[PDB]
Design a binder for this molecule. Structure first.
Ligand code: NXL
Ligand code: NXL
Ligand code: CO
Ligand code: CO
Ligand code: CO
Ligand code: CO
Lengths: 246, 245
């Protein structure tokens, strides 16, 4: 239950000219560290990181039938070629297939979505802006601190959802496996916004490493899609320098 | 049905290996293999037994839960990598025999036998010692039966809770890529003799796109320098089929 500033991590930000924040917490000690306490508490559009709660809610409400649900490509055109295919839950999460999750949100509906975001203490819990886009271009905002809190509850199966559904979503979030560690993670990208009002990019997740568990959340301002790989490379370098991965 | 594909034998002959690969797309109703007879021949499971043993441990409550830590008592263990506290995935991935020996002891013979019958797990023969039957006893399982067992696990159709099946499934993840997850487990009984060799295993499944592939590899082994072939031969076969890599 603590947080401390460590401004030395700022070196990885300054080298790439990035304005952003990294939050890293050790589960055993309940201790977090961040480069920027102020930005750690600033709230941004979750963008595709919202697929985590949306998946849990989808399963809870029965909108997603089960773990082996296939989301069929009806076949019409879409915004990315990688979305123009049948997808599993992991596939739809991993490729961040927006129309899949828009449909899930519509079927859940506003009253149930609101209820679950309250139960999950998910950001400002403001779902105004259209049920199928509040997380991408609406009023919903969440901080890096809140993302770590949320992911810890998921890891511990302490969200207000079945253990089974929490487990389903956890496996779908596995992005790297090594003999000494598993990484569960999710990216997000709201867009380039304006040069005055940039978009946000995220990488959030946790690392199960020996007997320790490290929860993390990264975000940064972004106004050019060329910068998007920094959302993984900055926190990856940090975690490598801490000995957690790599 | 099981259908022979003798073209796969290339990857075996090249390394002078006597073994079998069984690969099934979608389900175990139809599998392909290099060797029809060896596909159904039964061998000691060795560390592949950690999969049922983990499920049974959770079902019985011996493993309290998903976040169970298996504490090291500080006494010598046969590998240094085992001389530390371990999570369930840790104990599976480093193949920490003593952790699983203790699980087995606590499960006990009666419950062990009950669950191996429920799982249709090989010859279901657990005799000769509760903490070593899968290591040096009479238990035997084929590559075909490993595929069936893993398919049941994937489908949550084993006689165990969905939760416990999901726990063990995640603990088996060994490779993650954007297009696929591999769940798998290795095993190695030992070298025995040139006349009576040990057995090496790699078993698992690949979740790819909207397809699933179940697999099981075993080979005779009498020299530990050959052990990496247990992964490389089936990996090469699956790479040529476009399933991984
Ligand atoms: C989520 O952020 N989105 C869906 C999809 N993938 O983005 S990610 O790779 O950054 O996770 C396309 C971009 C984005 C969106 N909704 O605009
Ligand atoms: C399982 O077969 N064993 C335990 C440990 N790891 O096994 S693996 O690498 O073959 O998966 C060492 C080898 C073997 C054993 N019992 O000695
Ligand atoms: Co409901
Ligand atoms: Co995990
Ligand atoms: Co043979
Ligand atoms: Co899986």
């Amino acid at each position: 239950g603590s947080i401390t500033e460590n401004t030395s991590w700022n070196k990885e930000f300054s080298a790439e000219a990035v304005n952003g924040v990294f939050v890293l917490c050790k589960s055993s000690s309940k201790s977090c560290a961040t480069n920027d306490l102020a930005r750690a508490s600033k709230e941004y559009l979750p963008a595709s990181t919202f697929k985590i709660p949306n998946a849990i809610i989808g399963l809870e409400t029965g909108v997603i039938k089960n773990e082996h649900q296939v989301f069929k490509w009806d076949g019409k055109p879409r915004a990315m070629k990688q979305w123009e295919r049948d997808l599993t839950l992991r596939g739809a999460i991993q490729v961040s297939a927006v129309p899949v999750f828009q449909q899930i949100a519509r079927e859940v509906g506003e009253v149930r979505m609101q209820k679950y975001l309250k139960k999950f203490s998910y950001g400002n819990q403001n779902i105004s802006g259209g049920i199928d886009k509040f997380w991408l271009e609406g009023q919903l905002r969440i901080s890096a601190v809140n993302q770590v809190e949320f992911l810890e509850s998921l890891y511990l199966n302490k969200l207000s959802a079945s253990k089974e559904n929490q487990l389903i979503v956890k496996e779908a979030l596995v992005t790297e496996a090594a003999p000494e560690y598993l990484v569960h993670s999710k990216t997000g990208f709201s867009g380039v916004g304006t040069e005055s009002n940039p978009g946000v990019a995220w990488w959030v997740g946790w690392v199960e490493k020996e007997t320790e568990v490290y929860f993390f959340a990264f975000n940064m301002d972004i106004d050019n899609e060329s910068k998007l790989p920094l959302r993984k490379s900055i926190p990856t370098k940090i975690m490598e320098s801490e000995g957690i991965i790599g």
